[PDB]
Amino acid sequence: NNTYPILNQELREAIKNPAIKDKDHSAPNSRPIDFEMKKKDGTQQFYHYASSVKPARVIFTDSKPEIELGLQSGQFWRKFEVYEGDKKLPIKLVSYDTVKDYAYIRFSVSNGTKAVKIVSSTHFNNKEEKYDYTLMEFAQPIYNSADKF
Amino acid sequence: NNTYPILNQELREAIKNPAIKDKDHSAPNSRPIDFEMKKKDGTQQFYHYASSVKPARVIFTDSKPEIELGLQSGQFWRKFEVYEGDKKLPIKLVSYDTVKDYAYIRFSVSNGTKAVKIVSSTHFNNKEEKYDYTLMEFAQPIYNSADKF
Amino acid sequence: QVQLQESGPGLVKPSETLSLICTVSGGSISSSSYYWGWIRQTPERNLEWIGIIYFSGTTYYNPSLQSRVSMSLDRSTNRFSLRLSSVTAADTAIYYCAKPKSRDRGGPGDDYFGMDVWGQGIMVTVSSASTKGPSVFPLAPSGGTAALGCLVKDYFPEPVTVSWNSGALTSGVHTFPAVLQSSGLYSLSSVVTVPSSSLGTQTYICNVNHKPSNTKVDKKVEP
Amino acid sequence: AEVQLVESGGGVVQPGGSLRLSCAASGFTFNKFWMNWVRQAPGKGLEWVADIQVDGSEKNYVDSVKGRFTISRDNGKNSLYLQMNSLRAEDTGVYYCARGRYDYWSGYLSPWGQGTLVTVSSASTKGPSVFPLAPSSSGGTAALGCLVKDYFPEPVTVSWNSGALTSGVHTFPAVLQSSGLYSLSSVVTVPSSSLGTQTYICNVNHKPSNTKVDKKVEPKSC
Amino acid sequence: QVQLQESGPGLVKPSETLSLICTVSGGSISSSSYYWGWIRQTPERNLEWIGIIYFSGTTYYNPSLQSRVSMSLDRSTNRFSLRLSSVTAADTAIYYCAKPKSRDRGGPGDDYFGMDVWGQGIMVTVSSASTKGPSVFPLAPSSKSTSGGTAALGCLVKDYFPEPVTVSWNSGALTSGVHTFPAVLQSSGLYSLSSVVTVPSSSLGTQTYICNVNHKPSNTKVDKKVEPKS
Amino acid sequence: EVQLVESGGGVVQPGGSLRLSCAASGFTFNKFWMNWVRQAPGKGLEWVADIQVDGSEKNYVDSVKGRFTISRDNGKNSLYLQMNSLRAEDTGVYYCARGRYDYWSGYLSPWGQGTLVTVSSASTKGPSVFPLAPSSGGTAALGCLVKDYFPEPVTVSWNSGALTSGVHTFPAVLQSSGLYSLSSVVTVPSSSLGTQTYICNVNHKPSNTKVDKKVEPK
Amino acid sequence: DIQMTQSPSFLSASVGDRVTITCRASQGITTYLGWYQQRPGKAPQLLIYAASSLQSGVPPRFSGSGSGTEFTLTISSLQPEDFATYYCQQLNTYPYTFGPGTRLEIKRTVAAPSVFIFPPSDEQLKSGTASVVCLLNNFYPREAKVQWKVDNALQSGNSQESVTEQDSKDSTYSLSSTLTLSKADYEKHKVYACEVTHQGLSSPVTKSFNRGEC
Amino acid sequence: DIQLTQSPSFLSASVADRVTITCRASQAVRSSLAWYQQKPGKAPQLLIYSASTLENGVSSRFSGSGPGTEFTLTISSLQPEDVGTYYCQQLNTYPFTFGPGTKVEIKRTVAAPSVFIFPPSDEQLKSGTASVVCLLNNFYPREAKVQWKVDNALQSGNSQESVTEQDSKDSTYSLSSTLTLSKADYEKHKVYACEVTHQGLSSPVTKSFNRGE
Amino acid sequence: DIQLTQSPSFLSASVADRVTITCRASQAVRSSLAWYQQKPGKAPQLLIYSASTLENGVSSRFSGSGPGTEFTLTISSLQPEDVGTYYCQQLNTYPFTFGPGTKVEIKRTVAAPSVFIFPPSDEQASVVCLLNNFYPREAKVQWKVDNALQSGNSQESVTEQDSKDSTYSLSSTLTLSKADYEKHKVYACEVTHQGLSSPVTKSFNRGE
Amino acid sequence: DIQMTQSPSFLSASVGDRVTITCRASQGITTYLGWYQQRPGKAPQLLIYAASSLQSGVPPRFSGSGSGTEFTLTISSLQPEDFATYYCQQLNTYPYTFGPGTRLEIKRTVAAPSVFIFPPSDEQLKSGTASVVCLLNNFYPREAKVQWKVDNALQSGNSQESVTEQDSKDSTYSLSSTLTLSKADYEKHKVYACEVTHQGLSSPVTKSFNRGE
């Protein structure tokens, strides 16, 4: 087990945690991984691409490949859940850039994963603004270590 | 697994709950246990004895010994808290008899327990009449099966 | 300032139930005390604690009268009551309705200091009964001295009020304790002394009042 | 409050048929509260349908519904189910999810969900005919409209000139015809000097069928 | 109803940064729209999308301009900005401020239908040339008693840089019959414009006519009056 | 209910040691940050230390570092504070207190009820109870000075608790002795002063002392 | 079941009144009773539980009163958001039954209806039936009556209406009665009338057209 | 039950004397002990609660000593109105039991009784008996002999006597001897007399009445 | 960048004609396609979104099409206020690209222009010539001095077609240096047009 | 350290009133700040977190405002149980420091003390030490001032005082001042006085005794 706050709570609320205020989230034993953010009909999901740090990041551990995602406008993100097939992943919150308003999340993903699904929302107009389905497609299949083209 | 209401609330308020209106609180696998009710100087507590069902009950389960107390004049009891040392035992309200005005409360107590502290209050003259300390002392030590001398 | 008073009856058959009522008079709202008491006094002038009833109707009776005693609160009428079953001659006592003394600060409260206001008390005899009301005969008078009186004879059970001139003349009055005659029946004498210059002028009317038997006989003394 | 009760699963069915209603719950510990289903036939009031205990160990139904509906839980998924079989005409209505008022309290319900419509009726999904209610000619105010006849099911959304004309409009509640089909009318009260010169088009939109009609309403040829 | 308006300046030098503001003033709290847009129109009458900025301050630029565009929003003053850097003559255009069409049901929300209300536009020329203020010479009416009953008149707004010009006849009280021409570039580098109006002939003795030549990039504002001479 | 029960407190002398305990129940102890906060008699709150979920990180205030050690035991559900090398500045009430949500530092609810730590090299001593004599109409005041005692507390009552009205038991004051001193008074009619007698009930439970002293005119 | 009944049923009142609605149960209940509020098109919300215990968040003017069988909901000083239908539930014995409701409307000066009659389109008569529509517009109270007159002879079984929810700005209603007849019933007869009773017209008002020529 | 004992059971003391009653319990009773005062034909009145606290309205001559097992009621200066019986009551254990009482007599000068004989009335001439009442009105002490005569003939078993509880003002008693004898036994004898022995009389004073005159 | 094509680029049609513009996308774009109307000197106004829904306060004469690749804007019955360019925008993929524009000219009967020639003022020498309300747009302005053509000395400017009249106006300015101007007699403006049966000439000369 | 200072540190206020209290920091802290409530004799409790956010179980009348250095807590409608000390804490960087606090008390019309003075006992002088006590009974507000005089000479650094918690019933403070002197010192001098200044007395009021009687 790790000591990081698992997200079972609005991202708007977990950023308020002092334990991960501006915490170093470095991982030099990692790499860039480009990505696309999509709707159910294969189109782009425009808010999600616009408001997420490119490149995302694969960290290599002694077990299973971990994926970091910066998400911009952190205090305006509400629901943030990540799913592999129909199996919900536990999302760990690692840092909150208070100057930039950037939340850095991390989810362990299965060996060979090409793309991952995202149920999310935002805080606009004193209302929850929903996004049922947001597929996060990755530029290539995700693996253990650097043994991929 | 517990489905009964855990008393975190005034006793006068939790008796309004419909889940436990005239609910069957029988438990054949149990026995009588006599008890005293006493102030901090060792004297008797006159109201807490006078308005408690004689005798109490010890209900035997596969894990730990449970005591049932019937509290007369329930609409008039405000605070009701029970402690073993000063570790707060949770109090499950099992029944409220509507005709007779009697609440029936359960608390799991530790094995070998001789007595138990009670912080409490009543609703008299539109005011809170506090009872700081009441010791519910038992006739003999409380164990969970048939071994009581 | 709470005053208290006791309702009858004063005669009970052995086996049958003694049923008395206490009506809370004064400052009232019957949550002017946290509890209410009953005390009785046996013919040897000894006092026994009967039991209490709290504000909420829960009770605490003496372990020596447990199986027989009972109490309700009424709260709409300003009343609390005493019931006593399976009655013997031993229970022939004066029964007293009472209220606790409460503390200095934030009173009334759950305090066991003593009882401050008390009823006037009600006598309750237990007998195979007869229950007879009194004949009232004069006592003929004859400066200074000049005495006269009412002989209250042949009544059962106790007590009697003797009052003279409606309460107005209480100077010098002596209401005697009764004596058990060997008829089975009681007898009381009541006298007052007054000036010899005031005989052929003033008018002297007894106020003989009997409960349980509803008899009120007033009567003059000439001669 | 962060308390949320989000229902789905409602729809149209026929007599003798089946439907499972769902209810998502977030912002409270789900395995510490009773859950209830209440209903509302269109126009009429509230009727208690069912409740279910904290861990699925006790369930109650109303005498109407008993032996056809089953109430159900899943504390791990935070869901409340209502499996409705053998459906009748008297079961058509709004179906509210509703949480007990406190931890382990049975009876009193707050808060509720926003409802899911359930229609039971052997009529096929048909789409409306829009027929113009033409305005016939003090001479300062004239009324005109669209009659939206022979569609199924609810709801429809009528607006006027693409939303531009919002003022003095009345869209009426529909009426169940003995066809089994609905019929509603929208009316707008308008200046009479504007009848010849200003154009009125009503916008009928039916989601359950994919029918849109934009009918023009004008004074009759006389 | 929301309205939008674009603020200056309309001259920028080659390699400087183009800095425009858009005030959303007009019945809103600036969270009356999920995102806000900037489009431009080039001299060839083509439209290029520049980018959006959402309610939350996150932006999404055109990959063609990306490396040079920048947008903030400012809730207190109720505005969003476009900043465009390392500018060239390829960037001489009319910049437009915009707000998405939102569904008529549950909105505003994250909807891509098109843009319903637009700012009025604002033209931005890109060169070194120093702002010049216009000479304003009259155009001489009913030059005859062979006038046709309706007689023509105007104001030759000459010798200025850059664009635009407002010509408002009287107070804007007479819009009817007015023709403000497009301007034409000269061998100087300086723009020259005509703006005429045609009105009845026995309304000269009676009615008074003056042009209102406004030039925003130069702070110049002349009021030349025009009657026949004699 | 979330529960936090502290033991271990009491009296210790300058230089000395004391280990504090905190039993925690009604939550997953291994998923929350645990903090210590203190409060010196009469004064306000001041953060002491915190410890991460698995005892990975610990932070101490500057005053306390080098001397106090904070620890855990997730299998026993308890939190420790090992206080060595103890000072005059350290005498106060010491609150156990949990992070407000899973893996949240800093913000603290709920806290525990409190455990007094005293640091004073003075010995356990019984109080001397001395009368406060009333001197000449319209309402007189009288009392009992309870002097020269250690440690806290004292429970004073009057006429065996049957005199509650107008009674002001004051907070104690530390004297340069090391030893405490309290005053207790009552307001009573003047006409009830040579007849009705007034006898205060000083009970000091950290020693064997209970003194009943009578207060009368001169 | 335990039958729950409610006296006031429909009740007119303005912003500021002291309003009292009641609820009655066929058996003894103690105080095991709740009150609920629901506005048009919206979900319900609990007001009062345990007969008189006020629910968390709800403003202080809502009373609860009663014990046994008779019960009472009392709103001290009424407001614009308070206008709604109001339900009582018993929670003594299953089924936990509701009441029929008490609907609460905004009182107003008596307003007469404007009346309009509408022919059927010709576009409709090609399908085989004809609907003739009559609009009653902006009237108080709700109690109106619509009578359909073909050749001066009363209709029945063949027409159904629906009323709008009380308006936001003018506290008025509107009514739309729709007459359904065949194309064959319809071509025979000539004059089609809509007679209208209301307390704001001293006379029963009628609008007519003649099928074919104006 | 905790038994409460009270010493003495009876007490004759003079006006202005210091009187100290005592009350013990069979076990520890803390300060939970009140003192009551019962006057003749009257309900008890709380004097002292909680060992040593005086009650509202009671005069400041009554004190009470402090906690344990031995307790004390003191009357500093005893007055004529302090006649009655003084009870203690504990409020430590239930039932709240009482003591036997301490009866308090007031010592006074010896005083002669006023003596009056009364006939049987015209109204009791109707069916029954003749009852002849003799009264000794204001005297002290309580020991006083009565003697009924019928033409110098002694009596026994006709007459029951009743004696007054002591006055709150005079500190005096009174006494009512009623001779009762059959009506046909009454019309036999011609003079009746009531002879009175007492300290305040040198030799015994008599009172006759002789039928009708 | 998804490319859009509009056919035609320009169009001329009479009042009460049924008009149809096209707009093709280089890929599939479902129903994500809006239509705009730029009137002269005004910002684009949204006509149609979702491919076929009509916008608030826009006339019922504009229809939609789609969804897929080829889209058509229809004007049922063409009126003189419809002048200007009609744009096509896709919102499927970013950047939300537009089409080149369809310019819509209103066709009407042939009106002669009214010719007016404006003399210069004394503070420096250009002479403007106005052609007020004419159709079609092909008109020819020939400047003269002493009866001599002036090739090179002038530049012209023409308005966008009127919202009501369906007419154009032309302004032609002949610039000269003052030594050229005051040293010279008569200044004519010969105008050719389809609505003028022989060229019409307006002139003045110095000091009159 | 990041220093947390607080305004005001004592605040007078009635039940119904609309109260505000500030917290300020020596550096910038985003909205990383809590508000805590502690009643007398009781553990603290979380009211507000993240500058604005309301902890579960807190009533809707407590607001939280400010961002940067200056922070605000607002109770819109004040109640009987809101009288307590309120603490801000920064949670930007360690050490996670609290501020001195702000104390909320009940408001009352101004009230003068009854001043009493007490000699040392004869019981205590036998130790070799002597404590003279002054009582200021039942006064509002808290700011009073005690000046001691031995033969009319101001004392200094030989007295300590303490004040009671405010009364629930009459909202009044009470004060005790103990002048401690030795036996030799005490018996050198004669007049011992206690002077009390306050808002409700117009001159300072002096009580005195002379040693011996």
Residue numbers in the entry:
A (entry chain I), B (entry chain J): 119 to 267
C (entry chain F): 1 to 142, 148 to 228
D (entry chain G): 1 to 137, 141 to 225
E (entry chain D): 1 to 230
F (entry chain B): 2 to 137, 142 to 223
G (entry chain H): 3 to 216
H (entry chain E), J (entry chain A): 3 to 215
I (entry chain C): 2 to 125, 131 to 214
Paper text:
We also characterized a second class of antibodies that are derived from IGHV4-39 and bind to the NEAT1 domain of IsdB. The structure reveals that binding is again dominated by the heavy chain, particularly by CDR-H2, which contributes 45% of the BSA. Remarkably, CDR-H2 F53 protrudes into a hydrophobic pocket of NEAT1 that is structurally homologous to the heme pocket of NEAT2. Therefore this resembles the IGHV1-69 CDR-H2 interaction with NEAT2. The sequence/structure analysis did not reveal any common contact residue among the CDR-H3s of the seven IGHV4-39- IGKV-derived binders. Remarkably, all IGHV4-39 germline-reverted antibodies exhibited very high affinities (with KD values at 37 °C in the single- to triple-digit nanomolar range), supporting the idea that the IGHV4-39 germline has intrinsic potential for recognizing IsdB NEAT1.
IsdB contains two structurally conserved NEAT (NEAr iron Transporter) domains than bind haemoglobin and heme, respectively. Among them, we identified two prominent sets of neutralizing antibodies that target the specific fold of the highly conserved NEAT domains of IsdB with a dedicated, highly specific V-gene response for each NEAT domain, IGHV4-39 for NEAT1 and IGHV1-69 for NEAT2.
